[PDB]
Design an enzyme around this catalytic site. Structure first.
Site, mmCIF file in Angstrom:
data_model
loop_
_atom_site.group_PDB
_atom_site.id
_atom_site.type_symbol
_atom_site.label_atom_id
_atom_site.label_comp_id
_atom_site.label_asym_id
_atom_site.label_seq_id
_atom_site.Cartn_x
_atom_site.Cartn_y
_atom_site.Cartn_z
ATOM 1 N N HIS A 1 0.834 -1.233 0.000
ATOM 2 C CA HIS A 1 0.000 0.000 0.000
ATOM 3 C C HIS A 1 0.860 1.271 0.000
ATOM 4 O O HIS A 1 0.296 2.371 -0.100
ATOM 5 C CB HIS A 1 -1.098 -0.023 1.060
ATOM 6 C CG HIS A 1 -0.605 0.061 2.469
ATOM 7 N ND1 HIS A 1 -1.093 -0.753 3.452
ATOM 8 C CD2 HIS A 1 0.281 0.884 3.053
ATOM 9 C CE1 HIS A 1 -0.532 -0.454 4.602
ATOM 10 N NE2 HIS A 1 0.289 0.565 4.405
ATOM 11 N N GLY B 1 1.864 5.829 10.185
ATOM 12 C CA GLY B 1 3.300 5.859 9.835
ATOM 13 C C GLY B 1 4.017 4.620 10.319
ATOM 14 O O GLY B 1 5.203 4.423 9.941
ATOM 15 N N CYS C 1 3.250 1.561 9.587
ATOM 16 C CA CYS C 1 3.153 0.446 8.622
ATOM 17 C C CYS C 1 4.544 0.010 8.197
ATOM 18 O O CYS C 1 5.423 0.869 8.030
ATOM 19 C CB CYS C 1 2.307 0.793 7.415
ATOM 20 S SG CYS C 1 0.629 1.277 7.871
#
Ligand SMILES: CN(C)c1ccc(N(Cc2cc(Cl)cs2)C(=O)Cc2cncc3ccccc23)cc1
Ligand SMILES: CN(C)c1ccc(N(Cc2cc(Cl)cs2)C(=O)Cc2cncc3ccccc23)cc1
Lengths: 306, 305
Positions: free
Chosen positions: B41, B143, B145
Site C-alpha cells: 500500500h 506511519g 506500517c
C-alpha cells in the site's frame, strides 16, 4: 492507537554487555570506552557475602583474577578500582560500539527499560518503574547481576540502574552506575526488606490521560478539586503526594486531551472512593502507575531514536 | 524470580529498518541482503485505498519513484516485484547488518516482539500475541506500517509479522513476510471488523504455571477435570478449546511444578467461577493469555540470544 508497556529499542545497550568472572562468580558487566562496570560483589563467594570487607577482598585481587569476555573476545583487565558498590575494570580494548551515553540517577516514579542478561548475553527487554520504596518489580534469576536499566533521549543512552539483589518478597534492588544504591539496602547477605510501597500518583494520572487518548472516557466526571483536597483524599489510599511540579509535567497531556489536570484529579478521587464498578481502563482492572507522563507522550506521539 | 512481559532484544532488527517513500506516502521497510520488504500500500494515495488494483498501480511505477533511506544513505532501487500484499524493492547494496533470518507464519496464540518504527527509526519494542481472531492488540500510530514482529532463536531472527492496518476497534492487522494476511483482512479501506475474540487458554495455563514457579499457589484447588468437562466450562467464558496438543505442550511446565495439566485446568475453572477476590497473580488482576508455554520456560530458565 493502543497502549502497551513499551521498552526502548535495546540495540545500543546490547553492544555494551560483557561477561565478568572472578573466581567462581560470573555476572554481567557494562563495557563503555575502555571500562567495564559491574557489581563489586563479583569479588565475593556466597560465604564472603555474609560479611564482606570489600576493601580487603579487592586488595587480594590482581588484574588477572578478573576474566572479561565480550562475546568470544577476551578483554585483558589492566586496572581496577571500586566506586561505591560498583567495580570499574579498565580493559586494553575500548568498546567500538560505545553509544553516546550519560550516567543518571533517577527519582522514584521514573521508568526505564531493563536489558536482562546472563553470561553477558541478553535474555530480554522490559520496562520497570523505580517504586517509591526504591525497589523494582523485575524478572531476574541468579546470574542477572550487572544487567542495566536505561532511557534513551535521541541518540543518548542514559544508564540509570545496575542490578545487584533480589529481596525476600521477590522484588529487586540495585544501584546507579556510580554504585549508589536506590533505597536503604547494602550489598551484604543480611536481613533486608522492601518497605511499605505507595502508588505513583502522577503516573496513574498520566495513564488515565493515555486511556482518554485511546477512547476510554467513562471515568471522567463533572467535578473538580483543589490540589490540597485531592492530596488529603489520595494519601488515605497510600498514594504519593501530587506536587505542583507533577501538575506542570502533566500540562502537555492536559492540553492534548482538553482535560484540566485538577479535573483528572477529581476523576481519580472518585475512582479511589468508588472503585471501577466492574469496569476496566485500557484492559486493566487496576490503576496502573508504571507509565510516566513522558512514556505516555512518547508512545501516543511516536517519538523515535536515531 | 519475578515474571514480566518481555520482548526479545531488538538490536538485530533495528539494523534492518529503513524508510520507504512512494509519492506522498512514507512508511517503514525491512532491509535484508539486497531486498527491502514493505506493505504494497506504499504505492497508494488515501484515494487509491477503497478498491486499489495493485498490479495496475505498480506497473505505472519506475524504480526511481521509490525513495529508500537507511539513515543518511539513499539506497538505489534497481527492481521491484510484488508477492501477495508485500512489495520487494531490489536495492544495489546488501545490508551489512543482515542477521541470520527466516520468514515464518505463526499460529493464533503464538507471541512475538514488535519493533514499532516511524520514518525507518525505532520508537520502542513490545510483546504481542496473534489473537485467535487474527488481530494483534498493538500500539501503532499512522506511519507505523512496515514495522515488523519477530522471534529470536539464538542468532536467528524469525520474522512473522509486518504491520499494515488498524481496525475500527483499535486492534491491528498485517501479513507474514510473504505478504499473506493473518485472518480474512484485505489491504483495502473497506468496512472490515475484528471477529469476536477468545482467550488463549493454553497461554493462561502456561502463566498459572509461571505463577507457581514464582512461589504463588493460592489459586490451586483439590480438584481435577476431564479435558472434555474443562472445555465445556471454559467455552462458556469465551476461552479457546484446549486440545491434547496443548496438554502435551504444557508437559515440561507440569513436570517442573508437579501439577498435572488437568489439575491446573481445574484451578483455571475455579478462577473463572470465583475471580481473584482482591488478589493478583504475577501482579495482574486479570488472567493473562499472551505468554506461551515456551515464553514461560524461556523467561523462568534465563535463555539468552
Ligand atoms: C555469590 N554472589 C556474588 C552473590 C551475589 C548476590 C547474591 N544475592 C544476594 C544479595 C545481593 C546483595 Cl547486593 C546483598 S545480598 C542476590 O540477590 C543475587 C540475585 C539477584 N537477582 C536475582 C536473584 C535471584 C535468585 C537468587 C539470587 C539473585 C547472592 C550471591
Ligand atoms: C495512505 N496510505 C497508504 C494508508 C495506508 C494504510 C492506512 N490505514 C487504513 C488501511 C490499511 C489497510 Cl492494509 C487497508 S485500509 C491504516 O490503518 C494505517 C494505520 C496503521 N496503524 C495504525 C494506524 C493508526 C491511525 C491511522 C492509521 C493507522 C491508511 C492510509
Amino acid at each position: 492507537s493502543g497502549f502497551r508497556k513499551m521498552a526502548f529499542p535495546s540495540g545500543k545497550v546490547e553492544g555494551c554487555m560483557v561477561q565478568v568472572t572472578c573466581g567462581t562468580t560470573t555476572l554481567n558487566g557494562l563495557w563503555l570506552d575502555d571500562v567495564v562496570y559491574c557489581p563489586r560483589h563479583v569479588i565475593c563467594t556466597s560465604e564472603d557475602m555474609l560479611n564482606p570487607n570489600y576493601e580487603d577482598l579487592l586488595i587480594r585481587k590482581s588484574n588477572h583474577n578478573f576474566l572479561v569476555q565480550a562475546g568470544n573476545v577476551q578483554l585483558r583487565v589492566i586496572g581496577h578500582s571500586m566506586q561505591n558498590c560498583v567495580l570499574k575494570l579498565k580493559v586494553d580494548t575500548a568498546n567500538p560500539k560505545t553509544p553516546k551515553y550519560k550516567f543518571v540517577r533517577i527519582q522514584p516514579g521514573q521508568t526505564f527499560s531493563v536489558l536482562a542478561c546472563y553470561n553477558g548475553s541478553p535474555s530480554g527487554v522490559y520496562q520497570c518503574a523505580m517504586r517509591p520504596n526504591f525497589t523494582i518489580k523485575g524478572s531476574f534469576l541468579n546470574g542477572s547481576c550487572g544487567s542495566v536499566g536505561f532511557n534513551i533521549d535521541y541518540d543518548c543512552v542514559s544508564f540509570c540502574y545496575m542490578h545487584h539483589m533480589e529481596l525476600p518478597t521477590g522484588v529487586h534492588a540495585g544501584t546507579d552506575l556510580e554504585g549508589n544504591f536506590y533505597g536503604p539496602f547494602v550489598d551484604r547477605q543480611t536481613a533486608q526488606a522492601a518497605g511499605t510501597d505507595t502508588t505513583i500518583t502522577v503516573n496513574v494520572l498520566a495513564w488515565l490521560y493515555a486511556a482518554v487518548i485511546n477512547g476510554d472516557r467513562w471515568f471522567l466526571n463533572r467535578f473538580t478539586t483543589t490540589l490540597n483536597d485531592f492530596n488529603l483524599v489520595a494519601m488515605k489510599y497510600n498514594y504519593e503526594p501530587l506536587t505542583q511540579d507533577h501538575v506542570d509535567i502533566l500540562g502537555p497531556l492536559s492540553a492534548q486531551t482538553g482535560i484540566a489536570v485538577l479535573d483528572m484529579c477529581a476523576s481519580l478521587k472518585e475512582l479511589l472512593q468508588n472503585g471501577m464498578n466492574g469496569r476496566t481502563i485500557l484492559g486493566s482492572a487496576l490503576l496502573e502507575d508504571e507509565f510516566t507522563p513522558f512514556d505516555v507522550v512518547r508512545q501516543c506521539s511516536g517519538v523515535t531514536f536515531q
